[model samples]
Target: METGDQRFGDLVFRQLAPNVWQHTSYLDMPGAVASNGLIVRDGGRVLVVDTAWTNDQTAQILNWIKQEINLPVALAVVTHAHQDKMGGMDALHAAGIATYANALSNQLAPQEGMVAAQHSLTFAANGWVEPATAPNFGPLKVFYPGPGHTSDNITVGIDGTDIAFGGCLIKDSKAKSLGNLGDADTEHYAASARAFGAAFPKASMIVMSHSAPDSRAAITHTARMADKL
Candidate 1:
């Protein structure tokens, strides 16, 4: 609950853990609201979980990494094909950052007029990818638990820190219902969350894309919302 906040131009970076940060920017639709991404540092390399709400915001995040973190972004992961998650994908690719996504995301992004990640994680017949137990860039593990917010939604977990970036699969504590269901599988959303929780049961901190990070309450809240549906 103790969030550290820093401003780089119009974007705000909030520290959620020792080496984990969250960058938030506003989305200008009919009504402006916030969107978030993550920054995780591991030795000389840094990884971006998602990008900003737009191209310019993502550029600022990249610049800040060079000027502040002083490390090359080893890779960038787009959790889903939504604009909130991959809107700044082109900027990352242009900056020579290797971007990754699930196979489904890579397939669906173009249909949404969004650029897909260059690298992709293949899923099995069960429509899920095995979680990375050991990654070169920190103790991060990326896995597709199931479909909720989007068909390609994936979660990222930091091992020692016990923080799980649930992307849009897990809602924040304040969320009354699934925020956006345009591309959601409401029928299977609850099951998807249960799968994620089963995979990372030790996750003490859960971060959502649009709201503040939460403890175990996020999982329970998501389950409650699913029940209502």
Candidate 2:
């Protein structure tokens, strides 16, 4: 496994493992960086793990993909249902790209409480609410993995890639210290991490939803951090 920071011209590509690439695009107003991933399989098909923050960055990533490889994105996976992850679903759907999210996401969208919570979070993240767009990517495997970041939070594993998209299940390495818990259920979060580790022990690399990718060592590191908390 490899770990370092580097950029490719206008885009940043951090290769945590073979064919696993991460791009850090900063959120315009907050000055905070959001991550998106590109996983290229051996046959040349590309799977975009998460849409960053806006349409512009998603477009830029699409263009960059076109420049590097002849393959169109075969699938787009949203690690969770939040706007930061699902915001660009409409754009991708318009471009003929299908999207995949946990099955619970579809059921949760129409719930009044979820809608209110979504609007609140979106308003805090940005300033306006982006319409909800459901983009389907055929059949997706839904793993509830238990409550970590949020009750709706889910981690997705692409069939061909040895990497698992462990959404905010793990913290960013640049984090100076631990104990950054939020709405997550701490007990369930730790239990879920352990369960996921057993489920994917052979996974050599992990692509996080909001930070750079890392080796399995990162999972253990995060577990230790949580234990301290």
Q: By TM-score, who's the top model here? A: 1
Residue 179 CA displacement from its true place in model 1, Å: 0.4
Question: Which candidate has the highest lDDT of all?
Answer: 1
Pairs clashing in candidate 1? none
Clash count (model 1, backbone only): 0
Per-residue lDDT over 19-83 for candidate 2, one digit per residue giving the tens place of the 0 to 100 score: 65676555655366565655454455676766756667667777767776568887776655565
**Residue-level lDDT tens digits of model 1 in 13-87:** 888888898888888787877887789998879989998878888999999888878989999888999888899
| Predicted structure 1, TM vs. truth | 0.92
Model 2 error, position 45 (Å)? 2.7
- For model 2, the stretches where C-alpha displacement exceeds 4 angstroms are 1-10, 42-44, 109-143, 158-162, 172-182
Per-prediction TM-score:
0.92, 0.72
State the local distance difference test value for candidate 1: 0.83
- Report each candidate's C-alpha RMSD, comma-separated, in the order given: 2.3, 8.1
